[PDB]
Amino acid sequence: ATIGRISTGSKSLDKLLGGGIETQAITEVFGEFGSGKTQLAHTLAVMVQLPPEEGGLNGSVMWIDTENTFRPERIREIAQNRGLDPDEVLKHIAYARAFNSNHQMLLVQQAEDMIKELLNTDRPVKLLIVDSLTSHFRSEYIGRGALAERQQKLAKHLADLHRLANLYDIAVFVTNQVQANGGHILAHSATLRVYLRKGKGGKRIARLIDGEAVFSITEKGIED
């Protein structure tokens, strides 16, 4: 397949990305609590359902939640203000809550069955979200003695996600909380790393790790 691109809602961030987030890739966004990673995830789940003339891919969505942070009312607000029907948008998002890190690993395997089901329809899966990818692993494996086991399990989970992205032409989008009092970047595993932070007057600022884009959080999700 050719490489597909999903607009983020912001022309500034799209330019930084070369057009938007790519299919056949894992995109990792990281930053402090409150920086807006989950608002970017909600915006993409709506943007992907637009036609290509408007920056979408006529796609279906699959969402794995680890912290109870998905909000259908927020999805309805973004859709209504992007000219789509809110009921139709929610109908094409498949949602599951991960109980712990082992169950989170099984949910990715289960996702592959719905992906095959939709593959030859007019609304195939084009976006897979994991928010938050690291939270269960961090709280379950504490200490230096337990680090090697935590890294083993994380490495396998990332390889599972890479396989789905490439075999089925899907954009994988994952969030990771990193601050002074805890949190670790996924080293070199994702295809692309994006650093997110809050600036003066509630502007959000993004930079590619290995110029900068600037945007706001609004009724449209995010915009310049």
Ligand X SMILES: Oc1ccc2[nH]ccc2c1
Q: Would you say 33 is a known binding-site residue?
A: yes
219 among annotated binding-site residues: no
CB 205 within 8 A of CB 214: yes
Q: Is 7 annotated as a binding residue?
A: no
Which is closer to ligand X, CB of 107 or CB of 192? 107
SS3 state of residue 55: coil
Q: In whole angstroms, what is the distance from residue 166 CA to residue 56 CA?
A: 19
Shortest Cβ 195–ligand X spacing (Å): 26
The response to whether 211 counts as a known ligand-binding position is no
Binding-site ranges for ligand X (CB under 6 A): 62-64, 94, 96, 107, 110-111, 114
**Which tokens is 136 given?**
């269960």
32 vs 112, which CB is nearer to ligand X?
112
Residue closer to ligand X by CB (options 117, 149) is 117
Between 111 and 206, name the residue whose CB sits nearer to ligand X.
Answer: 111
CB 213 within 8 A of CB 205: yes
- Cα dist from 163 to 24, 62, 72, 109, 168, whole Å: 9, 16, 29, 11, 8
Q: Provide, rounded to whole angstroms, the least separation between the CB of residue 100 and ligand X.
A: 15
**Is residue 93 helix, strand or coil?**
strand
Spatial distance between the Cα atoms of 180 and 138, rounded to a whole number of angstroms: 14
| 38 is known to lie in a ligand binding site | yes
Nearer to ligand X, 64 or 213 (CB): 64
35 has binding-site annotation: yes
Record the tokens describing residue 168, joined without a space.
């089925």
The least CB distance from residue 110 to ligand X, in Å, is 4
What token pair was written down for 142?
């504490």
Please report how close the Cβ of residue 146 comes to ligand X at its closest, in angstroms. Answer: 27
Q: Which is nearer to ligand X, 11 or 74 (CB)?
A: 74
> Nearest to residue 18, comparing CAs of 167, 162, 218, 192?
192
> Least distance from C-beta 173 to ligand X, angstroms?
13
Q: Collapsing DSSP states into helix, strand and coil, what is residue 85?
A: coil
**CB of residue 62 to ligand X, shortest distance in Å:** 4
d(CA 72, CA 92): 12
Tell whether 32 is in a known binding site: yes
Task: List binding-site positions for ATP.
Answer: 31-38
Task: List binding-site positions.
Answer: 31-38
